[PDB]
Amino acid sequence: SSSEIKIVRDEYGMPHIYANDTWHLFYGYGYVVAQDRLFQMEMARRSTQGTVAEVLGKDFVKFDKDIRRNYWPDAIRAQIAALSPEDMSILQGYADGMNAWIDKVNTNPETLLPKQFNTFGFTPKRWEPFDVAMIFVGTMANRFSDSTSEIDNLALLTALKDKYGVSQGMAVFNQLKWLVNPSAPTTIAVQESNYPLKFNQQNSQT
Amino acid sequence: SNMWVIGKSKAQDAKAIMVNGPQFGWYAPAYTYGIGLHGAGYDVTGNTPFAYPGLVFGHNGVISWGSTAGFGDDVDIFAERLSAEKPGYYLHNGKWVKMLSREETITVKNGQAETFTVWRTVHGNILQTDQTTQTAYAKSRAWDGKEVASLLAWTHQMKAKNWQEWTQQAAKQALTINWYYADVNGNIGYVHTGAYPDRQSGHDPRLPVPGTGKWDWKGLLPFEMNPKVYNPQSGYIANWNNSPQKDYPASDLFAFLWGGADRVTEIDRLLEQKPRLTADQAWDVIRQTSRQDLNLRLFLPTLQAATSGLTQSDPRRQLVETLTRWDGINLLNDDGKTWQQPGSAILNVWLTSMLKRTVVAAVPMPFDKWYSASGYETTQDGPTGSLNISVGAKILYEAVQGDKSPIPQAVDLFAGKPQQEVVLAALEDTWETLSKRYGNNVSNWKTPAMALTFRANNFFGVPQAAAEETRHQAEYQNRGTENDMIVFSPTTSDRPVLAWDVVAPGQSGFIAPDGTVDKHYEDQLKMYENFGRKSLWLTKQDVEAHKESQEVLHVQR
Ligand SMILES: C[C@@H](C(=O)O)c1ccccc1
């Protein structure tokens, strides 16, 4: 049956979802997630979107401002908008499934509402695809692939040039923050191949 | 994060083996989520962070995949040019272009709401730091506009059945991430995925560039340029956030280097030590690397050279002989609080003093502070992540290697004094410090072990559970937040694949309103502690025979 979603959990509680089409499959994942980690996911949504202060107060105003200054919601929204229906079905299904459990939670909170919600003084609301996307954006892209210290680096170089002079300053920057080191242990062996490019280590953009 | 993939030429009782330990820090409930999907073209089992649609760690019975952060430099900063007369505009290619901007309002519990504006240019969102009437800085990511494509790529890769299909997906993942591959036939592979800028000639990517136009990226580099290897001669693929490939450049972070001193060598030796490894021996590499002091191998030879000619009764010499007898594998004493050997503390104190005396002294205040950490610093709760060799230490290593370093020592970190003198004096400091805290009988020194904490606040510092939900583990272990292993074509099992993982504290974070914790709220916590693991099921048959519960939903979209 194309409307059927089967959920089986193993001896550790790990869920297995069985479904015919994309939307039902991810609905199923979304359902079990909202069962297992609702508070964690609610607080993760709030973290990735900068809405923590709404529920935790003024100690998180700067946190919230910082999160929002580091992304552009509209661009994330437009990416979702360009998705094929099959790819859209992954985000919509997931969100829809969470919504199904969330609705049973708020219908019968006396027994299904995670205790933390009571402790922290609020209730869970429904999710949209944008929300699922930002979980990933906020905890994978911004946490692990958004790294730079270029402003600081320029300031070190500046200070080194002042202490040691222009040429020696530069040479010392190349000693502390080399572009490449030929002795670095590599995951790919030298016999297999090497990186075709170069790169300038003398600040030629100034 | 670490990962070792073992191929057919090195796998014993199997054709391939994959052991992954991503290091995201430790949290309660668990950072990753276990899930299996069966239908709509997927057939998978594994666990994934924050339950993303796509499993970062898992297999489909045909191939297996894993990840480690890549730390390539995929981010640059453009210094935009502003003017007081055109507030909200910036000069780009001879024209004043209006910035993108939006209004935001932070609602606050039991506080007043605050409104603020966010600004963006063609190069990226503006940094709220380093701001002047003339200049503002924009953060440019090569992955900009491809966030959602990277999520989908990580989902569609789960459907691949060979190297070709899998690289097609790897090509669509734009973040800087190392992806790994293995399959039933014994093939293995690695790809340093991600979008990287094709910079103008002369662009030093460790430093900002003007935003006026001439320094704009030409585009992005093609996938052909992404480092990759399929079935290496070596018969294995090992990574611990080290460099992908010869002459490949690292992140521009001042605190991040790929040099002679790299923790990945520790994995390399254990894999090269024996010609073939079974699955159990591949798993034990976690325990061994978890406990391995990472500085001993790097500086023992220097320490030995400096003390080789001292008399037997010189305490500096005794401290070195102590390290010489040690394998560097830390173990708890029966008290559950101290380490059996004082080697790390010796190293920590010696290294700290060496850096103060060398790298730190050569660098202008207060940048000097960036090179002072020994890499052992922590809190009563323990490290928030992995343990690594510190920037300072890596720089010191190039210096104590002398002529064996390909890095020119523009300035002598030892400032004219012989190295031995400096090494010795650092050992003098170490003996004074340690002998006053522990007394003069090294053999009874009981130094504090590091502990491990599963925090109730997530990485952002935000509560994701109540404070009392925090869990503690006596022994800190330099290992993945989770560990998973996939073994292909095992000779002693009837299935063409076996998999295992551990998701502590448990699969579930649920607590009912009356405070009743879920059946699987804490059942993997002790298993994590003792380097144990539970089976991951894939086939309908395996799943049915280990079922504990079942629910069938009927819905139409
Ligand atoms: C924890 C982090 C790392 O290896 O730096 C990471 C990011 C993405 C995938 C795996 C690990």
Ligand SMILES: [Ca+2]
């Ligand atoms: Ca850069």
